[PDB]
A paper describes a structure:
A key step in T-cell-mediated adaptive immunity is the triggering of cell-surface αβ T-cell receptors (TCR) by peptide-loaded major histocompatibility complex (p/MHC) proteins on target antigen presenting cells. Whereas antigen specificity is dictated by the amino-terminal variable (V) domains of the αβ-receptor, signalling function is mediated by the non-covalently associated co-receptor CD3γɛ, δɛ and ζζ dimers, which bear cytoplasmic immunoreceptor tyrosine-based activation motifs (ITAMs). The B4.2.3 T-cell hybridoma, derived from a BALB/c mouse immunized with P18-I10 (RGPGRAFVTI), is sensitive to picomolar concentrations of peptide presented by the MHC-I molecule, H2-Dd. To gain further insight into the dynamics of TCR/MHC interactions, we employ complementary biophysical methods to examine the high-affinity B4.2.3 TCR in both the liganded and unliganded states.
To elucidate the details of the ligand/receptor interaction, we determined the crystal structures of both free and p/MHC-bound states of the B4.2.3 TCR. The unliganded TCR crystallized in the P31 space group, with three heterodimers in the asymmetric unit (data collection and refinement statistics are provided in Table 1). Superposition of the α- and β-chains of the liganded B4.2.3 TCR with their unliganded counterparts reveals marked changes in the disposition of the CDR3α and CDR3β loops, with little alteration discernible in CDR1 and CDR2 or in the C domains as observed in other TCRs2224. In the structures examined here, CDR3α, spanning Ala95 to Lys102, undergoes a large conformational change upon ligand binding, in particular a 9.1 Å displacement of the Cα atom of Asp99 of the first molecule in the asymmetric unit of the unliganded TCR compared to the same atom in the liganded TCR. Resonances from several residues within the β-chain CDR loops, CC′ loop and FG loop were absent in the TROSY spectra, likely due to conformational exchange line-broadening, suggesting the sampling of alternative environments on a μs–ms timescale. This is consistent with the multiple crystallographic conformations observed for the same residues among the three TCR molecules in the asymmetric unit. Mapping of affected β-chain residues on the X-ray structure of free B4.2.3 TCR suggests that the α/β-interface in solution is in good agreement with the crystallographic interface, and is dominated primarily by contacts between the constant domains. These NMR data are consistent with analysis of the X-ray structures of the TCR, which reveal that the Cα/Cβ interface has nearly twice the surface area as that of Vα/Vβ (1216 versus 698 Å2). In particular, Tyr125α in the unliganded TCR interacts with Asn133β and Lys134β in one of the three molecules in the asymmetric unit and has long-range contacts with these residues in the other two molecules. Notably, the H3 helix does not participate in any crystallographic contacts in our study.
Residue numbers in the entry:
A (entry chain A): 3 to 191
B (entry chain B): 3 to 235
The structure:
């Protein structure tokens, strides 16, 4: 727990500024790099700061540092859905070689897109190759709508997933539901 | 730039080897493991050739650096709890650490539980075209055990990324079985064109040529299983 990140999970709307906090206890630390990791990818250094410094800025990203409080914070101004990922903060002492970076447990960031005029509707799809196979689809719903989870032992629901079509700047949400049972409607869920 | 083998399937009990390389000829390299859900964990550290030091969890691991450019991770006996994503790390001039693309290692008790996925493609709802004036395709892969599947959409022979949304993690449907889904959404006009070909490909990574398997059953090697469709109405 040498490096403590906060919050454990962060979700913001697009355009808003995402704030990722972190604190430490050992006065030895003098180097604090932030690593960005997209799903299915490895961590990459985004921006770093030294304890002798008070603020580090790189484009839309900015690090605020408090040496006396042994706390720091990462601000993503005008956050975009593209930069939505898990962010790790590390810590080093001498900042020389064998720095021995102490890693934070990371903070997962999700940047929700502003969708104007949502038209939430549920549609049922079908697999022609195999009859009596029911599929449920929830789409065009608003982003603050919390997708319900249910354990019916045989029924499965996917997490929400933001979609982007290149035609007519307008983002869309989507959810998937299915069951091993032959007959069941998507209307009631 | 650092590189390493992407996917690997090994049985529990036998030796495992992971390799890593870099082209910047620096000194310090690292080996990390990360469970798919949460923590990034350090295994070993190599400062130079033949200079290695234990990390946070060196137990069950050992390393070898006979050359500065390459770093190999060695598991003499694979365990079930040693299933995670392994990251080779590197740094020059102690200002920034570089990570590779990672290696997804899955250790199984019995190789026979390894099965390819069953890929199903669902056609869009007529009401969707009617009410939303657009058509959404849905691909579903089930019956596979390793999470070594890679889903991609192909339209008329070309891989598309716009209008594509795939689930980040496979779902545990059974003890030895996973399930993964994804969706593709295009205009009703484009879907109403019969000259348009849609294909949902799922790349499964299985066993290598050097593996033991019975003769009365198909060997689940690295392969692609896809489902296709055409423009209707």
């Amino acid at each position: 727990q040498q490096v403590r990140q906060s919050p454990q999970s962060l979700t913001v709307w697009e355009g808003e500024t995402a704030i990722l906090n972190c604190s430490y206890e050992n006065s030895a630390f003098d180097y604090f790099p932030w690593y960005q990791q997209f799903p299915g990818e490895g961590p990459a250094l985004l921006i770093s700061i030294l304890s002798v410094s008070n603020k580090k800025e790189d484009g839309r990203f900015t690090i605020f540092f408090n040496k006396r409080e042994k706390k720091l914070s990462l601000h993503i101004a005008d956050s975009q859905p593209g930069d939505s990922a898990t962010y790790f903060c590390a810590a080093s002492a001498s900042f020389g070689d064998n720095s021995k970076l102490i890693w934070g447990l990371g903070t997962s960031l999700v940047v929700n897109p502003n969708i104007q005029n949502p038209e939430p509707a549920v549609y049922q799809l079908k697999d022609p190759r195999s009859q009596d196979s029911t599929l449920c689809l929830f789409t065009d719903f608003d982003s603050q709508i919390n997708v319900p989870k249910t354990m019916e032992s045989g029924t499965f629901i996917t997490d929400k997933c933001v979609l982007d079509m290149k035609a007519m700047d307008s983002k869309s949400n989507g959810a998937i539901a299915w069951s091993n049972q032959t007959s069941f409607t998507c209307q009631d869920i | 730039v650092t590189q390493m083998p992407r996917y690997l399937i090994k049985r529990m009990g036998e030796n495992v080897l992971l390799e890593c390389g870099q082209d910047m000829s620096h000194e310090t390299m690292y080996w990390y493991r990360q469970d798919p859900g949460l923590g990034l964990q350090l295994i070993y550290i190599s400062y130079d050739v033949d200079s290695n030091s234990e990390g946070d969890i060196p137990k069950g691991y050992r390393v070898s650096r006979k050359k500065r450019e390459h770093f190999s991770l060695i598991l003499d006996s694979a365990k079930t709890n040693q299933t995670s994503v392994y990251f080779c790390a590197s740094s020059l001039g102690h200002t920034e650490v570089f990570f590779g693309k990672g290696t997804r290692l899955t250790v199984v008790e019995d190789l026979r539980n390894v099965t390819p996925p069953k890929v199903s493609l669902f056609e869009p709802s007529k009401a969707e075209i009617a009410n939303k004036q657009k058509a959404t395709l849905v691909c579903l892969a089930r019956g596979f055990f390793p999470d070594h599947v890679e889903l991609s959409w192909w339209v008329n022979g070309k891989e598309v990324h716009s209008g594509v949304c795939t689930d980040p993690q496979a779902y545990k449907e059974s003890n030895y079985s996973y399930a993964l889904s994804s969706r593709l959404r295009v205009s009703a006009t484009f879907w109403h064109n019969p000259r348009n070909h849609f294909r949902c490909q799922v790349q499964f990574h299985g066993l290598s040529e050097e593996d033991k398997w019975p003769e009365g059953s198909p060997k689940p090697v690295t392969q692609n299983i896809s489902a296709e469709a055409w423009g209707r109405a």
